[PDB]
Amino acid sequence: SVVEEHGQLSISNGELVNERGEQVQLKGMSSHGLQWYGQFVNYESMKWLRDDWGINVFRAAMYTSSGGYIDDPSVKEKVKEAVEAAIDLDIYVIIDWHILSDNDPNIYKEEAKDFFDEMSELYGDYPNVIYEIANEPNGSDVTWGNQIKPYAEEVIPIIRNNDPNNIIIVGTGTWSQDVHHAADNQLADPNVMYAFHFYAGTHGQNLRDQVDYALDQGAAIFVSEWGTSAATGDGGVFLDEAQVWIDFMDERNLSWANWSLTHKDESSAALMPGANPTGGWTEAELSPSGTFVREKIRESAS
Ligand SMILES: *[C@H]1O[C@H](CO)[C@@H](O[C@@H]2O[C@H](CO)[C@@H](O[C@@H]3O[C@H](CO)[C@@H](O)[C@H](O)[C@H]3O)[C@H](O)[C@H]2O)[C@H](O)[C@H]1F
Ligand SMILES: [Ca+2]
Ligand SMILES: [Ca+2]
Ligand SMILES: [Ca+2]
Ligand SMILES: [Ca+2]
Ligand SMILES: [Ca+2]
């Protein structure tokens, strides 16, 4: 029903809108690395998230490094499973080329182009797909002007050859925080959004102001990763500040995906160790983070 209702998404003056030009705000979950916690990504768990949490988007985090796609491309099978489940469930899905330790997107540019050509050839005709071409550029030697923009200018045409209109999310500097630099030197493609990532135990007002600067430049922003913990994904749970961030995003209608759907023993994890991989979770199987995020999505669902 989500995709049936909104259909083809597009950007209109920095806003994510549906095929009728109305605002759309996606709220969902991101998987953790598919090479480690892929069992939590399947039709049943996605259906449970759709039906019990109210998600309207699912993010498949395909790490490139750290035992991911570069070393073992079989993980692509999990990405396809996720996309196919999202199509069957009628929700949106983000295919995330999840760079991190490989901090410059240009490290695996050829492989990225090849992967996105394949993904866009396979799924380019479905409105469900959103491509996220470089999770988190990072490092002092990696900037928008020198590394990220040019990378995007090479990958985007590859996708556009097969899929002229689906949304493309592009990572920004300093672990997808530097949306101000991107907003001052935007890509030409009309259907792009810049990623902004935050952790409630580490980031606050200064970064909210930075996002506002970017929005004031007409840039579209997708919060494709955010956590209730510290920036490491652990170090405690900060729901007071997480709610400040939630309100901030609602005021601005920013779409988001929470990190992350896993049973790993880290504060940002949504599930407790041993949680059922196919869903149907008891309240006891959700962590404090998970309980809170589920409420945030339910309280705005339908
Ligand atoms: C956005 O931020 C989050 C939070 O920092 C990042 O997610 C964290 O990524 C860590 C690095 O991949 C990950 O730790 C790794 O976990 C693996 C699976 O258990 C371990 O094998 C590995 O030793 C360890 O470094 C955190 O668990 C995870 O929250 C996310 O990648 C960024 F995009
Ligand atoms: Ca099955
Ligand atoms: Ca091709
Ligand atoms: Ca398309
Ligand atoms: Ca080039
Ligand atoms: Ca709204």
What is the length of the chain? 302
Task: Name the one residue in this structure whose structure tokens are 């259906």.
Answer: 47
Distance CA 156, CA 171 (A): 13
Cβ contacts of 37-41, under 8 Å, gap ≥ 24: 37/260, 37/261, 37/262, 37/263, 37/264, 38/75, 38/78, 39/277, 40/261, 40/262, 40/263, 40/271, 40/277, 41/78, 41/81, 41/82, 41/261
Resolution to 1 decimal place, in Å: 1.8
* Cα 281 to Cα 60, 169, 202, 273, distances in angstroms: 20, 31, 29, 12
Q: Where are the domains of the chain?
A: 1-302
CA-closest residue to ligand 1 atom 17: 36
Q: What distance in angstroms lies between residue 211's CA and the mean position of ligand 3's atoms?
A: 35
Residue 79 tokens read as 């990405």
Ligand 3 midpoint to CA 111 (Å): 13
Q: Which residues pair with 198 in a beta bridge?
A: 226
Which ligand is located closest to the Cα atom of residue 146? Answer: 5
CA-nearest residue, atom 4 of ligand 1: 233
What's the CA gap between 283 and 73, in Å, rounded? 35
Among 30, 32, 40, 289, which residue has the most ligand 1 atoms within 8 Å of its CB, making it the best to mutate? 32
Catalytic residue check, 136:
yes
Tokens of 120: 């866009």
CATH number, domain 1-302: 3.20.20.80
